[PDB]
């Protein structure tokens, strides 16, 4: 009631990747100097389970999303069990399996966050949406530092066979518990009222701003400047003690595709920054914006988010599959998307001298700013692991989600190598001749989120996202015919409304 | 001694507004699309008492303002009593009153801040300056959300007859206590010394900056670049570890009115931003600036504050009544008003290539910024109720004053309707035929502010705002002849000086 | 959580109907013989509050309707208070009010269900939807038995001034508590499958 | 906007009472509680009299009212995998939303509602 407890489980399959041998991986020499990566590929595999798919399913997303203002995770517990090591041999056109029993698997974990922590991109393949079937574990490895291809001093290279591990035979299991520290609840409410009008419309404030300057002489010219008390009426002159959050700009692009010159403006016309002289564009903006009321056919080029419609073939797939989140609901506070934040004076005015204006395309944070977060679509990420640093400035990760400083640990996996027969003559160096095998087992987690209840004295119904209706040949979600699973539309949580 | 306790009281009068019936209120269709408001008007009335007039009077403003570095409120208590319900009937050219006794009045309050909290603009009519006479209570009602006129989903509409109330007959009273959480003391000291010179003038620092580049060959041209250790002398090259606060720009306008082209530049030339595509100008700037030393005839167009000289007829009143606060005292740190914050390089320089500069009109917050607040004029507001949000970035409300997250509650009032005689035939629907009546009573509050004392080892006298002198035909403040009350000049608190 | 508690309140106005005199009421003789009613009209007025408007408002209807399979009422409590008797006089083209104080009002109740219980049709005028304004109390009276217009033996005619009442001056209030016995929960679920 | 309890008549032949209006079948419904305001005559004629004069003093009355209920409800739990219907407020830019007063103080209530939304397998 006060808090909800989630539990999941899955089965998984672990191959062997590098042939049990680290391989440094680097960028191609033909890759443009905007792109160079120099790094390592380890055999170890690792679990992810960072996304909301794992823990909810649509119904329990409603039950959560409609009834609560906010929530946070209060702990988690985690389990591996039913570990079944398995062998495979290929003779000629023949196959075999024959589980080999006593062979083991290595796991450990890091509380110390010592090893490089890489999730962060929401790389695909965390866990299957929907409980059925199975997923093969992805392997590890990391970029570090490059310069132009090549290498520089420092440049890391950890080992991963150092740390005390645990070696788990068939019929042995592994767990650990973890507890989040705390974070402010994630927002849900949609902010009934905009900032621009917070005011009682009936009375009028006692400040006069400045009325029409100039005024006729005579019929023409005087420097007379007069004042008019504000309130009701024109509004828009209201003295206001708060400010809307910061923004840049984006290149507006239409889903209609009736427009946009020919043209290729991307990525040339896109917004980007270059760190260390290598251009980098910005996929999430600082979480903000919208398109605008009544438009819906325009969206920011690099803004918002994509996802996609299964099955989605990468690299040049057309618009129908992508799904393009709208982001319209934060319109209350954040300063929309592609607009000049607002005009500001430039040149002073003499008797002979006209004044600008000339405005601006950006702002930056200022005292008295307020802004809201972003929304989380349940196929999105969860926690971002703020880097270990100084200059935080509170961490509202652009992906959305929680800002953990000590995220849940990482827990890589590997299955111990078994050599084939040696030559008995001793030898130079190290033979490979490995015995091909892989592994499988279960997995669990659980969370126990804590959520704050909802209460409001509003008189009328509210929105409360629904299942829609009416005779779709294929409803959604649930499998169509031959076993493929679907997920039409994104969801995200802002529905309940709180007065600002 | 350690802390001062304030107490006030007044008498008040409550009419009946809507005829006891909610009326949705909307913007005119002829109102330009920059202006649309769609909202409600409830019968309920409400108290304000948010301004400094209520609690002090000029003398006790001195006694406070001169002797203390800073202060904050530590609690308050509040009272209604001596409630006298009253009736009025009009027959023909006749009048009558005849207090009706047992009829009641409804009050309650909200600690939960559930209902929309609207003060925020310093709408006129809180309480009378000066204890005499009486004030009629303003009514409630709120804007919420519009789009273009019209309406959208959400859009609120609370009731106000839901909550448990208290119904107070003649000879019954009502109170409650409230306690502020805490806030840093409000500043007073004026910062004796500017940032630019913090340094001991006698010694010189050991960093060399960069001296004249170029230098003659020969007599003309060399790329020679040489260095000169700083200190004393030129100054202005001093390495400095702190930065002045952020700013925009304003349109400078003269009180002299000898200038400014013809011209109407307002509001076209004014500084503004448009949220959701509707332009909004900025009445308080981010609290900052000044005009400059020795000028005093120039002030920012949209900057500073107005107030006005009683009696002040709204809409086009001339300059003599407005009073135009100067804001000169923060000159120490904040970066004045209409000036380019400062130049910054633009293009690199080759052997053939000249460099800019080209500067900037704005900045935004940066690490190592410092700035000071604003000053509070005792006819200004007090607490702003920071909205319930995430992105605070400490709340220094542009109106000035304290940043309460849980402000003192709101406490609306209404007087229960009494119908006239029915028709005994039963009826359709609901008759009105109300009995015209209104109400009156007392009011109290009190605060008990806590203030920190002042001590300084300065050797010489200080400024300490005074009453001036010399044979004014009308002193100030105190009533002139026929009972009208005056308040010449604003006041505000920065007088005592602290070394920075 | 387990159970929700509702509370409402309203203001109301009570006229005087028959001039304080019972009047037997009957069907018109011209009314077709499919229609004949023979009955009484008493001065007494009565409260209704039997409809869901009174207790919920749309939002709290959602909050209920979406989250639960079923429900039943487990009790109720009831109150009258702030009773203000009032007078009206009409001289010529003039009006007056002048609350008269000590005059009283009579109420009682029936647990025994003795008197004819008539609600049953959802006659209009129970309470106002929405809290505002006010509603005038409807009067009582009942049909019993007719034959063709006229009357037959039996045919009732209660009094209503028999029972012990309570007479409530200004500055006096009245309550009682009541408890439902039990009923199976009302259904909500829509039955997924035929 | 419908009724609530029907007061099954005092009888024999019940055959469980599912009142056609809908709502609960109480055998002992909440009581009835009629009201009346005592008559005050005008001045008599002092000559005594036949019969009974009327000459009443016109008056009426007003006051408050309360009730309350405390319903008991059973919670909902279902293992269904997909969203459900859950009646909503609709959307989209109605010149007049619903319910809440339009302009001059009249109150509205568009559409009926009724409760069947949540789904249980039969």
- Following DSSP, what letter does each residue of B399-412 receive, concatenated? T-SB--SS-----E
- How far, in Å, CA of B10 to CA of B18, rounded? 25
Query: What's the gap between Cα A95 and its chain centre?
Result: 42
Q: How many CB atoms lie within 10 A of CB B128?
A: 16
Beta bridge partners of A438: A86
Longest dimension (CA), chain C: 72
- Which of C9, C57, C97 lies at the smallest CB-CB distance from B435? C97
Nearest to C59 by CA among D91, B158, B115: B158
Select from A463, A465, A475 the Cβ nearest to the Cβ of D82.
A475
Closest partner CB to D35 (pick from C11, C105, C117) = C105
Among the partner residues C16, C130, C171, nearest to B102 by beta-carbon distance? C171
Per CB-CB distance under 8 Å, the chain A contacts of D111 are none
What are φ and ψ of residue A491, in 5° steps? Answer: -125, -80
- D-facing residues of C in 34-63 (CB < 8 A) are 43-47, 49-55, 58, 61-62
Virtual torsion, Cα C13, C18, C20, C22, nearest 10 deg = -130
| D58 to B155: CB separation less than 8 angstroms, yes or no | no
Picking from C14, C100, C183, the nearest residue to D62 by CB comes out as C14
- In this complex, is the C-beta atom of A478 within 8 Å of any C-beta atom belonging to chain C? no
Burial (0-12, 13-18, 19+ Cβ within 10 Å), B305: buried
Q: Which residue has the tokens 């009602």?
A: B141
Structure tokens at D41: 């005559």
| A426 in reach of chain D (CB within 8 A) | no
Q: For residue C39, report the phi and psi dihedrals to the nearest 5 degrees.
A: -160, -165
Question: Distances in Å between the alpha carbon of A189 and those of A60, A94, A462, B159, B388?
Answer: 18, 61, 11, 20, 11
Breaks (C-N over 2.5 A) in chain A follow: none
Sequential DSSP letters for B467-490: ---S--SS-SSS--SSS-----S-
Give all strands (DSSP E) within A191-264, no chain letters.
243-244, 252-254
Cross-chain residue pair B338–A348, CB shorter than 8 Å: yes
The answer to whether A25 touches A40, Cβ cutoff 8 Å, is yes
The verdict on a CB contact (< 8 Å) between B161 and C17 is no
How many Å apart are CA B37 and CA B142, to the nearest integer?
10
The CA–CA distances, whole Å, from D76 to A64, C52, C183 equal 13, 22, 19
Q: How far is Cα A193 from Cα B452, in angstroms, rounded to an integer?
A: 39
Query: What's CA A136's distance to the chain center, in Å?
Result: 23
* Token representation of residue B291: 């005009």
In contact, B177 and B76? CB cutoff 8 Å? yes
On the question of a cis peptide bond just before residue B263, with omega within 30 degrees of 0, the verdict is: yes
- A262, B38, B153 from B157: Cα distances, Å: 48, 11, 11
CA distance C166 to chain D (A): 10
Q: Are A6 and A55 in contact (CB under 8 A)?
A: yes
Could you tell me which of C60, D79, B36 has the C-alpha nearest to residue A234? B36
Whole-angstrom CA distances from D63 to B362, C50, D60 are 64, 19, 11
CB D66 within 8 A of CB C80: yes
DSSP symbol at B58: H
- Would the CB atoms of D4 and C105 count as touching at under 8 Å? no
The DSSP H or E segment spanning C24 is strand C23-26
Instruction: Choose the mutation target among A60, A456, A459 for the interface with C, i.e. most C CBs under 10 Å.
Output: A459
Chain A residues whose CB is inside 8 A of the D82 CB are 58-59, 467, 475-478
Whether residue A351 contacts residue A209, with contact meaning beta carbons closer than 8 Å, is answered with no
Return left, alpha or beta for D33; rule: phi > 0 is left, psi -120 to 50 is alpha, else beta.
left
Chain C residue numbers touching D58 (CB-CB < 8 A) = 16, 87-90
Shortest distance, CA B430 to any CA of chain C (angstroms): 6
**Location of structure tokens 């800002």:** A403
CA distance A264 to chain B (A): 28
Experimental approach: cryo-EM
Q: Are D9 and C119 in contact (CB under 8 A)?
A: no
Question: C43, D36 in Cβ contact below 8 A?
Answer: yes
Indicate which of B40, B41, B149, B150 best probes the interface with D, i.e. most D CBs within 10 Å of its own CB.
B150
* Closest CA of chain A from B280, distance in Å: 5
For D11-52, the DSSP string reads: -S--S----TT-SB--SS-----EEEE---B----SS--SS-
Tell me phi and psi for residue B51, to 5 degrees.
Answer: 175, 160
- How long is chain C? 194
The C-alpha atoms of residue D44 and residue D47 are separated, in whole angstroms, by 8
Radius of gyration of chain B (CA): 29
- The phi and psi torsions of C90 (rounded to 5 degrees) equal -115, 110
Q: Are A443 and A79 in contact (CB under 8 A)?
A: yes
- In degrees and rounded to multiples of 5, residue B70 shows phi and psi of -165, 170
Contact: C59, A460; criterion CB under 8 Å: yes
B322 close contact with A: CB closer than 8 A: yes
Is D92 near chain B, with CB under 8 Å? yes
Residues A202, A204: Cα–Cα separation, whole Å: 7
CA distance D28 to chain B (A): 29
Pairing of strands B369-370, B412-415: unpaired
Work out the angle at residue B338's Cα, subtended by the Cα atoms of residues B337 and B343, and round it to the nearest 5 degrees.
110
Hey, is B177 helix, strand or coil?
strand
- Gaps in chain C (C to N distance exceeding 2.5 A) after: none
The DSSP bridge partners found for residue A94 are A91
Peptide bond into B205 cis (omega under 30): no
Q: Tell me how far apart the terminal alpha carbons of chain B are, to the nearest angstrom.
A: 27
Tracing tokens 């019954």 back to the chain, one arrives at B172
Question: Which residues on neighbouring strands pair with residue C90, listed in sequence order?
Answer: C95
Whether A440 and chain B come into contact, CB under 8 Å, resolves to: no
Task: Tell me the shortest Cα–Cα distance from B436 to chain D, in angstroms.
Answer: 16
d(C-alpha A279, C-alpha A273), whole Å: 6
| Other CB atoms within 10 A of residue B54 CB | 21
**Is the separation of the CB atoms in A339 and B275 below 8 Å?**
no
Give the mutation candidate from C108, C139, C169 for the D interface (greatest D CB count, under 10 A).
C108
CB A342 to CB B159 under 8 A?
Answer: no
Q: Name B481's Cβ contacts closer than 8 Å, sequence gap at least 6.
A: none
Among D32, D88, D99, the residue to mutate for chain C (most C Cβ within 10 A): D32
Pairing of strands A369-370, A243-244: parallel
B167 interfacial to chain C (CB closer than 8 Å): yes
Distance from CA of A469 to the nearest CA of D (A): 8
Per the listing, tokens 């107005």 go with: B306
For B259, phi then psi, to 5°, come to: -150, -160
């Amino acid at each position: 009631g006060d808090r909800v407890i989630t539990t999941s489980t899955r089965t998984w399959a672990l191959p062997t990747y590098n042939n049990h041998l680290y391989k440094q991986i680097s960028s191609q020499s033909g890759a443009s100097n905007d792109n160079h990566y120099f790094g390592y590929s380890t055999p170890w595999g690792y679990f992810d389970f960072n996304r909301f798919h794992c823990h909810f399913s649509p119904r329990d997303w409603q039950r959560l999303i409609n009834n609560n203002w906010g929530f946070r995770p209060k702990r988690l517990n985690f389990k591996l069990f039913n570990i079944q090591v398995k062998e495979v041999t290929q003779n000629d056109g023949t196959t075999t399996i024959a589980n080999n029993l006593t062979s083991t698997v290595q796991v450990f974990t890091d509380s110390e966050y010592q090893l490089p922590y890489v999730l962060g991109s929401a790389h695909q393949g965390c866990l299957p949406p929907f409980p059925a079937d199975v997923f093969m574990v992805p392997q590890y490895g990391y970029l570090t530092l490059n310069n132009g291809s090549q290498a520089v001093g420092r440049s890391s290279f950890y080992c991963l066979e150092y740390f005390p591990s645990q070696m788990l035979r068939t019929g042995n299991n592994f767990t650990f518990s973890y507890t989040f520290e705390d974070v402010p609840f994630h927002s849900s409410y949609a902010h009934s009222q905009s900032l621009d009008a917070l005011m009682n419309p009936l009375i009028d404030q006692y400040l006069y701003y400045l009325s029409r300057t100039n005024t006729p002489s005579g019929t023409t010219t005087q420097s007379r400047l007069q004042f008019s008390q504000a309130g009701a009426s024109d509004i828009r002159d209201q003295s206001r003690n708060w400010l809307p959050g910061p923004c840049y700009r984006q290149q507006r692009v239409s889903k209609t595709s009736a427009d946009n010159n020919n043209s290729e403006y991307s990525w040339t016309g896109a917004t980007k920054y270059h760190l260390n002289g290598r251009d980098s564009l910005v996929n999430p903006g600082p979480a903000m914006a919208s398109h605008k009321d009544d438009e819906e056919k325009f969206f920011p080029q690099s803004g918002v988010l994509i996802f996609g419609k299964q099955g989605s073939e990468k690299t040049n797939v057309d618009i129908e599959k992508v799904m393009i989140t709208d982001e319209e609901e934060i319109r209350t506070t954040n300063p929309v998307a592609t607009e000049q934040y607002g005009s500001v004076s430039t040149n002073l005015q003499r008797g002979n001298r006209q004044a600008a204006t000339a405005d601006v395309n950006t702002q930056g944070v200022l005292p008295g700013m307020v802004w809201q977060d972003r929304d989380v679509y349940l196929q999105g990420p969860i926690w971002a692991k703020i880097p270990h640093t100084d200059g935080h400035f509170h961490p509202s990760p652009l992906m959305g989600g929680f800002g953990l400083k000590h995220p849940p640990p990482q827990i890589l996996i590997k299955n111990t190598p078994v050599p084939a027969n040696p030559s008995t003559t001793f030898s130079a160096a190290k033979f490979a001749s490995f015995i091909t095998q892989y592994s499988t087992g279960q997995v669990s987690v659980e969370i126990e989120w804590e959520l704050q209840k909802e209460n409001s004295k509003r008189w009328n119904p509210e929105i409360q996202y629904t299942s829609n209706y009416n005779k779709s040949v294929n409803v959604d979600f649930t499998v169509d015919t031959n076993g493929v699973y679907s997920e039409p539309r994104p969801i995200g949580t802002r529905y309940l409304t709180r007065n600002l």
